[PDB]
Amino acid sequence: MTEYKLVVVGAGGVGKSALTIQLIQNHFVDEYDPTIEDSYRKQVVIDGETCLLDILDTAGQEEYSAMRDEYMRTGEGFLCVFAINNTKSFEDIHQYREQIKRVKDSDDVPMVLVGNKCDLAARTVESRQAQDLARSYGIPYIETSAKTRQGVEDAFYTLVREIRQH
Numbered sequence: 001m002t003e004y005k006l007v008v009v010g011a012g013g014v015g016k017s018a019l020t021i022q023l024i025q026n027h028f029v030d031e032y033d034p035t036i037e038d039s040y041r042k043q044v045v046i047d048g049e050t051c052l053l054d055i056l057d058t059a060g061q062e063e064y065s066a067m068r069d070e071y072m073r074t075g076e077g078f079l080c081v082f083a084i085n086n087t088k089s090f091e092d093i094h095q096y097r098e099q100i101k102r103v104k105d106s107d108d109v110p111m112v113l114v115g116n117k118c119d120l121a122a123r124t125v126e127s128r129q130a131q132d133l134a135r136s137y138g139i140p141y142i143e144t145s146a147k148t149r150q151g152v153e154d155a156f157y158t159l160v161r162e163i164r165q166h
């Protein structure tokens with residue numbers, strides 16, 4: 001069956017792991033344990049196609065980011081995650097996209113911009129600001145909450161649909 005290799009990237013603490021764990025394991029991780037590099041695999045049906053999602057959950061903390069570039073190389077699509085209550089994480093997105101372009105050696109890589117923690121009211125990144133950034137990259141913007149599950153499946157499935165357009 002078709003395997004989609006997805007890679008989740010973004011600043012430390014934005015919720016990359018919580019999103020992936022919610023998708024794969026159907027619970028919310030409340031604590032914060034920084035990731036090195038973890039992978040998850042699950043067979044799912046997306047738009048009538050039985051397929052395997054192979055998801056690489058990467059480090060956002062510089063201290064743990066050792067060989068992230070080598071892990072990212074085989075990725076077919078990238079979820080670029082920031083948190084809507086973390087302006088710095090949003091500003092960091094451009095640099096993650098630059099890293100993606102570097103490791104794929106392409107200016108045309110399947111990606112989705114994800115604004116996570118949308119259950120929180122301490123918003124400093126407005127939807128329109130993120131929409132504009134995504135538009136400049138030619139990709140969709142989707143807001144999510146790993147806590148409530150809002151948009152979680154939608155974000156990952158959208159990324160699959162982006163890979164399918166390439």
Ligand SMILES: Nc1nc2c(ncn2[C@@H]2O[C@H](COP(=O)(O)OP(=O)(O)NP(=O)(O)O)[C@@H](O)[C@H]2O)c(=O)[nH]1
Nearest residue numbers: 012013014015016017018030034035060117145146
């Ligand atoms: N309210 C709320 N908290 C969230 C959400 N997603 C993650 N968190 C919280 O934010 C913290 C960090 O989440 P985590 O998934 O570990 O972040 P990360 O991006 O994987 N971090 P790292 O890059 O260090 O591995 C945790 O306390 C987690 O519960 C969300 O959608 N809403």
Ligand SMILES: [Ca+2]
Nearest residue numbers: 027028029030
């Ligand atoms: Ca929990």
Ligand SMILES: [Ca+2]
Nearest residue numbers: 102103104105
């Ligand atoms: Ca390269």
Ligand SMILES: [Mg+2]
Nearest residue numbers: 003004005076
């Ligand atoms: Mg494949």
Ligand SMILES: [Mg+2]
Nearest residue numbers: 016017034035
């Ligand atoms: Mg993590």
Ligand SMILES: [Mg+2]
Nearest residue numbers: 124125126129
């Ligand atoms: Mg503002």
